[PDB]
Amino acid sequence: MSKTRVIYPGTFDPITNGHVDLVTRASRMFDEVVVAIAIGHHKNPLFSLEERVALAQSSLGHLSNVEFVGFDGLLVNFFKEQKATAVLRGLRAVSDFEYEFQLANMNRQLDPHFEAVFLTPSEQYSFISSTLIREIARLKGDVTKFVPQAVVEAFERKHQQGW
Ligand SMILES: CC(C)(COP(=O)(O)OP(=O)(O)OC[C@H]1O[C@@H](n2cnc3c(N)ncnc32)[C@H](O)[C@@H]1O)[C@@H](O)C(=O)NCCC(=O)NCCS
Ligand SMILES: [Cl-]
Ligand SMILES: [Mg+2]
Numbered sequence: 001m002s003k004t005r006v007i008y009p010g011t012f013d014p015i016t017n018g019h020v021d022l023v024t025r026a027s028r029m030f031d032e033v034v035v036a037i038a039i040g041h042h043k044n045p046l047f048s049l050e051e052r053v054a055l056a057q058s059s060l061g062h063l064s065n066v067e068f069v070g071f072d073g074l075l076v077n078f079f080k081e082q083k084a085t086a087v088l089r090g091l092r093a094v095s096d097f098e099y100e101f102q103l104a105n106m107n108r109q110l111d112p113h114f115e116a117v118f119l120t121p122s123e124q125y126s127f128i129s130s131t132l133i134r135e136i137a138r139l140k141g142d143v144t145k146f147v148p149q150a151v152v153e154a155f156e157r158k159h160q161q162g163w
Contacts, residue, residue: 004085006117009036009075013045014151015056016133018125022090025119027063034082035060039072046134051154059148076111086115092126138163 006026012019012035027033037052045052049070060066071078079087087107091097104116121128128146137143137155144152 003032004030005032005034005083006030006086006088007034007036007079007082007084008088009038009071009078011040011043011045011130012037012052012056013040013130014047014052014133014147014154015059016125016128016130016147016151018090018092018121018128018146019056020059020148021122021125022088022119023060023066024063026088027065030085031065033063033066033088034084035066035068036078036082037068037070039070041072046158047154055148055151055154058150074110076107076114079107079114080111086117089116089118090121091118092121092129 008023008026010019023033023035035056037049037056039049047055053068053070057068060068075087089096089100091100100116100118104114107114107116133143133146137158140159143155
């Protein structure tokens with residue numbers, strides 16, 4: 001019996017309570033979990049790589065089997081470099097499901113060792129996404145209930161520099 005290593009890739013822009021729940025659930029089932037923050041070089045995230053990594057560490061660093069790394073390039077090359085057992089993704093809607101079904105099949109064609117496992121959110125996180133959270137924050141809504149406190153403060157310090 002070997003040691004399992006799953007990657008959880010995303011932009012995490014910012015990390016939410018939904019992501020936290022997924023990583024916590026995953027850390028019970030695999031030996032190592034890698035929170036893999038896509039840099040988004042040609043995709044314009046609101047938070048920098050350093051901010052997104054720090055928010056993720058702050059929220060999840062208490063889990064001793066979770067690592068945090070930024071990456072770019074082809075997910076399958078990262079998968080190989082990392083020697084992962086699988087990629088993990090959350091499926092919160094039908095459109096998520098169809099996109100991920102397609103991508104898992106494309107990635108398996110690029111690398112036959114590739115694997116993707118999916119979790120479904122618990123109902124109390126099911127309506128949360130990073131995009132929606134950015135939008136509420138931007139229109140000065142309170143996102144406290146949906147994201148870790150550190151993220152709330154991070155939005156206040158974008159709102160303080162101006163935003
Ligand atoms: C697809 C990319 C950008 C990351 O995905 P995404 O932008 O959805 O990140 P986000 O951080 O918002 O979410 C991460 C994942 O957890 C899920 N999730 C988000 N919120 C929640 C919630 N409340 N509950 C459950 N799941 C959730 C998402 O649906 C997603 O699967 C990234 O994997 C990537 O760019 N890969 C590298 C490039 C590549 O190889 N591209 C195409 C060739 S296959
Ligand atoms: Cl996003
Ligand atoms: Mg999201």
